[PDB]
């Protein structure tokens, strides 16, 4: 019998594995979409952080 | 009518009054590459009117003992105008062609020309006469340029293949009794959507006199032959600096 709050609300025993990622079907290579020029500030996909 | 024609494309126009219809290579018109057949990812360029125009390359003399000549495409244009500039600056290339051959004489001249288009026309050598030597054609023979090159053995077309069967290829005759011009429209012929314009040659153009020129003394002895051609639906891709060859 559980009566104390720290045991009632406890998270001990969670046996399921939290998965951040999922598998998606990929029978062929990915397609390429049409693109055009872009001249704006604040949105930069070239710069990263390794 | 049918004997009269006018071809206009870009900023050029060709008129004729002794035509013999127009031959469409393999029953197909030149076209652009589709999205399901393209493989490169960058956006190709389509300069349109600045490259799709008639270019006149040079003039050859027809004599009683001439054997024939051949031209390689697009080697004839790799160094002419905006088309040549684009072909030098870019890695890839794709286009068709529209060929017009001019040759006129009088009603008292006779002779016949066979104008044909043979894809992948690889030129073979005489192999040193006896045939024990492993030779390869030199540069001036494989890639003569815009000046053309003369056949040495027209009966075999310098490849060991008989000229009597050259009519299986898209072709027209220039018979002085009937016509004075020929037109063949060639789509893009290749196993690749795009190919190099400098290393690879798609086809070759053959002009061989089957019936010898003959006229009576006193008539005009100088009968020239002229080649005019226009690229169609040109594309280019893979831009970098220019390369000479």
Main sheet characteristics of chain B: 5 strands, mixed
Form type of chain B: globular
Put simply, the count of helices of chain A is 1
Distance between the termini of chain A: 51 Å
Instruction: Say what the CATH topology of chain B is.
Output: Jelly Rolls
Net shape of chain A: elongated
Distance between the termini of chain B: 45 Å
Report the portion of residues of chain A in β strands.
under 5%
Strand order in space, largest sheet of chain B: 3-10-6-12-4
Structural class of chain B: mainly beta
Number of domains of chain B: 1
Q: Regarding quaternary structure, how should these chains be classified?
A: part of a larger assembly
Describe the sheet with the most strands of chain A. none
Total strand segments of chain A: 0
Q: Return Rg of chain A in Å.
A: 24 Å
Protein name (chain A): Genome polyprotein
Organism (chain A): Human enterovirus 71
Subunit structure (chain A): Interacts with protein 3CD.
Family (chain A): Belongs to the picornaviruses polyprotein family.
Give short descriptive properties of this protein.
part of a larger assembly; 2 chains; A: 50 residues; little secondary structure; 8% helix; elongated; B: 245 residues; mainly beta; Jelly Rolls; five-stranded mixed β-sheet; five-stranded antiparallel β-sheet; 2 helices; 5% helix; virus; thermostability; capsid; VP1; VP2
Task: Provide an overview of this structure.
It is classed as virus. Keywords: enterovirus, thermostability, capsid, virus. Purification of Enterovirus A71, strain 4643, WT capsid. This is part of a larger assembly, with chains A (about 50 residues) and B (about 240 residues). Chain A is largely without helices or strands. Chain A is built from one helix and no strands. Chain A has one helix at about 5-10. Chain B has helices spanning about 80-90, 140; strands at about 5-10, 10-15, 25, 55-60, 70-75, 90-100, 110-120, 150, 170-175, 180-185, 205-215, 225-235. The chains hardly touch.
